[PDB]
């Protein structure tokens, strides 16, 4: 249900078991646990300035 | 002939809290005299059909 | 089968500091290295908590205490003496009530119409021929009807031995009742000490949110009672445990989240000018 736009790239982190979303200092979306293949892949912005 | 299997509460001391359930069937006291657990004048059953 | 005990020595109550204890996670989101200022119901630092104990000098405390805005409950014990709680508004058959009991094989949570005893307790019996401690009493309530919510867990088996020494277990709970949800936060620490709460810092994490939807103003604590051949209404022996109670207040706090997403420190914004 979380929609967004960007570039998908593999990375790693750790989550507490009852946690799914991890925010940023700027309160954007940093980290998410993939539902089908249970990994911790995250997102990076697409536009370049 | 009339279906009388559905009930609702008519009298209460105070308004309900959100998502609160009350199933007590104590005799409501409308007047100043105590009801002493029996119906009568100014003493009504709280539920109605 | 309600029984009211007779042997009980009089004793004045006791009061203790709160130190910096009784803080919980206010959100389930994962945040890292964040200093967040919030305003919520918290236990004030160095507040006035009330002390009760069960030792045997005939001390066995389980009175009815108010539930003004949610409570902080601390239990220091070496053996499993404190067995659960009951929450309600009148604690009779006229109103619904909530019961949380560990009966040494299962943990049971029931929101029923109970008829509680005047002195509810659990019991354990000690047998000398095989030296075994077993559960043998459930003098809690007389009747239960018109129940709404019921939950029992998977069976287990715990130790009921009355060990002698120092308090090796400290358990902290925060109870809140908001919008028809009974929220329980819990924490467990191993210790080696006696007679007082260890000052320090608490890191209570969320445990359960039961959708019970009742009105709660009073509560009582259900303990365990020891019986053996060394000893009805008088032939019983107390254990060795203590529990401290405190009340939450609307305050403003400044929480700190480390790189692992855990609360490591907090500042109560009402204590001294430095804070
Ligand atoms: C009363 C409600 C009650 C709750 C909510 C409860 C929760 C609870 N108790 C646990 C352990 C335990 N629970 C207890 C005992 C207690 N701990 C308590 O909260 C209380 C009051 C006792 C009873 C004295 C003990 C001794 C353990 C450790 C068991 C072990 O490590 O194998 C655990 C960890 C089990 C796991 O992670 O698989 C949970 C979640 N236990 C309870 O009995
Ligand atoms: C929850 O229960 C409490 C305890 O009975 C209720 O408070 C009482 O309300 C009546 C009705 O006005 C008063 O006469 C009593 O003096 C109150 N007692 C206390 C200790 O406050 C409370 O009203 C109940 N909650 C709701 C929403 O009805
Ligand atoms: C330990 O000893 C006690 C005391 O005898 C045992 O309890 C008895 O259990 C049997 C059935 O198992 C009952 O018929 C007796 O009435 C019990 N005794 C009493 C005094 O109530 C207990 O079973 C033993 N535990 C073991 C052998 O593991
Ligand atoms: C005390 O714990 C026992 C478990 O040893 C609970 O026993 C349950 O009893 C009911 C009816 O007799 C059975 O349907 C369950 O299967 C039992 N649970 C088991 C075997 O794990 C008992 O309910 C507990 N006491 C209370 C008051 O709930
Ligand atoms: C289906 O669900 C299982 C269970 O979690 C999961 O392991 C798996 O990756 C999911 N997807 C597929 C294609 O099987
Ligand atoms: C204590 O228990 C006895 C027996 O269960 C009962 O008769 C008595 O009324 C109780 N005490 C009070 C104050 O109700
Ligand atoms: C706590 O309360 C008791 C009685 O209400 C009082 O005597 C005491 O001064 C209070 N404060 C402390 C720190 O014990
Ligand atoms: C807190 O410290 C000790 C016990 O830890 C106590 O004697 C002292 O009076 C308390 N200080 C307060 C309540 O300000
Ligand atoms: C409460 O119990 C009484 C007595 O059995 C019964 O008549 C009544 O229908 C019950 N009410 C509810 C809501 O279960
Ligand atoms: C975070 O958790 C890891 C995993 O055990 C641990 O090695 C690390 O020390 C923790 N971070 C801190 C600051 O303690």
Q: Which ligand is nearest to the CA of C146?
A: 9
| Three-class SS state of B49 | coil
How open is the CA angle C248-C251-C253, to the nearest 5 degrees? Answer: 115
Which of B3, B46, B49 shows the shortest CA–CA distance to B23? B46
DSSP, residue by residue, chain C:
-------------EEE---B---B-S--SB--SEEEEEEEEEPPTT--EEEEEEE---EE----EE-SS-EEEEEEESSS-EEEEEEESS-STTS-EEEEEE-SS-EEEEEEEEEE-SS--EEEEEETTTTEEEEEE--SEEEEEEEEEEEE------------SSEEEEEEEEEEEETTEEEEEEEEEEEEE-SSPPPSB--BEEEEEEE------EEEEEEEEEE-TT---S--B---EEEEEEE-EEEEEEEEE-TTS-EEEEEETTS-S--
Q: Determine if ligand 3 sits within 6 Å of the CB of residue C163.
A: no
The DSSP result for A1-49, as a single string, is: -----SEEE-------TT--EEE-TTS-EEEE--SSS----EEE-----
Residue identified by tokens 């620490």 is C189
Separation between Cα atoms, residue C241 and residue C243, nearest integer Å: 7
Task: Report which protein residue has its CA nearest ligand 1's atom 30.
Answer: C158
Instruction: Give C163's contacts (C-beta < 8 A, 6+ positions apart).
Output: C78, C79
CA–CA min distance C1, chain B (Å): 25
A34 contacts A41 by C-beta, under 8 angstroms: yes
Look-up of token digits 């559905």:
B6
Sign of CA dihedral C163, C165, C168, C169: positive
Integer Cα distance of C115 and C164 in angstroms: 36
For CA atoms C255, C257, C261, C263, the dihedral sign is negative
Measured CA to CA, the distance from residue C143 to residue C148 in angstroms comes to 15
Which residue's CA is the closest to the ligand 7 atom numbered 6? C15
How far apart (Å, rounded) are the C-alpha atoms in residues C23 and C175?
Answer: 12
Query: What are the chain B neighbours of C215 within 8 Å (beta carbons)?
Result: 17, 20, 22
Dig out the tokens for C241 from the structure: 């445990």
C88 touches C67 (CB < 8 A)? no
Tokens in use for C15?
A: 């009061």
Long-range contacts formed by C92-99: CB under 8 A, 24+ apart = C92/C116, C93/C143, C93/C145, C94/B24, C94/B26, C95/B24, C95/C215, C96/B21, C96/B23, C96/B24, C96/C146, C96/C148, C96/C214, C97/C214, C98/C182, C98/C210, C98/C212, C98/C214, C98/C216, C99/C140, C99/C141
Cβ neighbors of B22 (< 8 A, separation 6 or more) are: B9, B12, B16, C215
Is the Cβ pair A19, C29 closer than 8 Å?
Answer: yes
Q: Which of C84, C98, C103 to mutate to test the pocket of ligand 4 (most atoms within 8 A of CB)?
A: C103
Q: Report how far residue C4's alpha carbon sits from residue C117's, in angstroms, rounded to the nearest whole number.
A: 8
Q: What contacts A4, CB < 8 A, 6 or more positions away?
A: A29, A43
Please give the distance of CA A2 from its chain centroid, rounded to a whole number.
10
Give resolution in angstroms.
2.9
Residue C132: phi and psi, rounded to 5, are -105, 140
- Tell me which of A17, A23, A40 to substitute to probe the interface with C (most C C-beta atoms closer than 10 Å): A23
Residues of C in contact with B24 (CB under 8 A): 94-96
Written as six digits, the tokens of C111 are: 């929101």
CB C31 to CB A19 under 8 A? Answer: no
Cβ–Cβ contact B18 with C under 8 A: yes
Closest residue by Cα to residue C161 from C84, C235, C81: C81
How far is CA C174 from its chain centroid?
9
What are C's interface residues with B at a Cβ cutoff of 8 A?
94-96, 146, 148, 179-181, 211, 213-215
Cβ-based contacts of B23 with chain C (< 8 Å): 96, 146
> What is the distance between the alpha carbons of residues C62 and C52, in angstroms, rounded to a whole number?
8
C147-184 b/e (C-beta count within 10 Å ≥ 16 → b):
eebeeeeeeeeeebebeeeebeebebbbbbbeebebbb
Q: Phi/psi class of residue C11: alpha, beta or left (left: φ > 0; alpha: ψ in -120 to 50)?
A: beta
Q: How many CB atoms lie within 10 A of CB C29?
A: 13
How far off is chain A from C270, nearest CA to CA, in Å?
Answer: 27
**Overall residue count recorded for chain A in this entry:** 49
Q: Residue C233 — φ and ψ, nearest 5°?
A: -95, -5
Between the CA of residue C213 and those of C59, C90, C110, C134, C157, what are the distances in Å? 35, 16, 13, 35, 31
Contact C95 B24 (CB under 8 A): yes
Q: Which residues neighbour B32 within 8 Å (Cβ) at sequence distance 6 or greater?
A: B42
Contact C246, C49 (CB under 8 A): yes
* Burial (0-12, 13-18, 19+ Cβ within 10 Å), C42: buried
CB of B23 within 8 Å of a chain C CB? The answer is yes
- Count of other CB atoms within 10 angstroms of residue B26: 12
Experiment type: cryo-EM
| Chain C residue numbers touching B15 (CB-CB < 8 A) | none
Distance CA C218, CA C64 (A): 6
How far apart are alpha carbons C113 and C116 in whole angstroms?
9
C84 neighbors C102 (Cβ within 8 angstroms)? yes
What whole-number distance in Å separates Cα of residue B26 and Cα of residue B44?
Answer: 9
Measured CA to CA, the distance from residue C29 to residue C261 in angstroms comes to 9
Burial of C90 (0-12, 13-18, 19+ CB in 10 A): middle
Q: Assess contact for C18 and C44: CB atoms under 8 A.
A: yes
Measured at the CA of C110, the angle between CA C221 and CA C219, to 5 degrees, comes to: 25
Give yes or no for residue C146 CB within 6 A of ligand 9. Answer: yes
Asked if B22 is an interface residue toward chain C (Cβ–Cβ < 8 A), one would say yes
Bridge partners for C251 per DSSP? C40
């Amino acid at each position: 249900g979380l929609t967004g736009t960007g570039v998908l790239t593999e990375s790693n982190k750790k989550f507490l078991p009852f946690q799914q979303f991890g925010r940023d200092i700027a309160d954007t979306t940093d980290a998410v646990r993939d539902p089908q293949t249970l990994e911790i892949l995250d997102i990076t912005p697409c536009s370049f300035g | 002939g009339g279906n009388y299997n559905y009930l609702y509460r008519l009298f209460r001391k105070s308004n309900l809290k959100p998502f609160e359930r009350d199933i007590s069937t104590e005799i409501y006291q409308a007047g100043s005299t105590p009801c002493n657990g029996v119906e009568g004048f100014n003493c009504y059953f709280p539920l109605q059909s | 089968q309600c029984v009211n005990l007779t042997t009980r020595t009089q004793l004045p109550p006791a009061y203790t500091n709160s130190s910096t204890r009784g803080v919980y996670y206010p959100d389930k989101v994962f945040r890292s290295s964040v200093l967040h200022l919030t305003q919520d119901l918290f236990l004030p630092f160095f507040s006035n908590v009330t002390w009760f104990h069960a030792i045997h000098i005939k001390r066995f405390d389980n009175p009815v205490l108010p539930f003004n805005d949610g409570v902080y409950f601390a239990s220091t014990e070496k053996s499993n003496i404190i067995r659960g709680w009951i929450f309600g508004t009148t604690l009779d058959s006229k109103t619904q009530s909530l019961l949380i009991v560990n009966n040494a094989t299962n943990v049971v949570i029931k929101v029923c119409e109970f008829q509680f005893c005047n002195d509810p307790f659990l019991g354990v019996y000690y047998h000398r021929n095989n030296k075994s401690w077993m559960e043998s009493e459930f003098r809690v309530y007389s009747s239960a009807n018109n129940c709404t919510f019921e939950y029992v867990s998977q069976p287990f088996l715990m130790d009921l031995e009355g060990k002698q020494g120092n308090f090796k277990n400290l358990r902290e709970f925060v109870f809140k009742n908001i919008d028809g949800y009974f929220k329980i936060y819990s924490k467990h620490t191993p210790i080696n000490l006696v007679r007082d709460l260890p000052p320090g810092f608490s890191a209570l994490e969320p445990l359960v949110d039961l959708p019970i939807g009742i009105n709660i103003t009073r509560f009582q604590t259900l303990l365990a009672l020891h019986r053996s051949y060394l000893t009805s209404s008088s032939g019983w022996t107390a254990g060795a445990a203590a529990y401290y109670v405190g009340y939450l207040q609307p305050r403003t706090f400044l929480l700190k989240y480390n790189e692992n997403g855990t609360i490591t420190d907090a500042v109560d914004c009402s204590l001294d000018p430095l804070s």
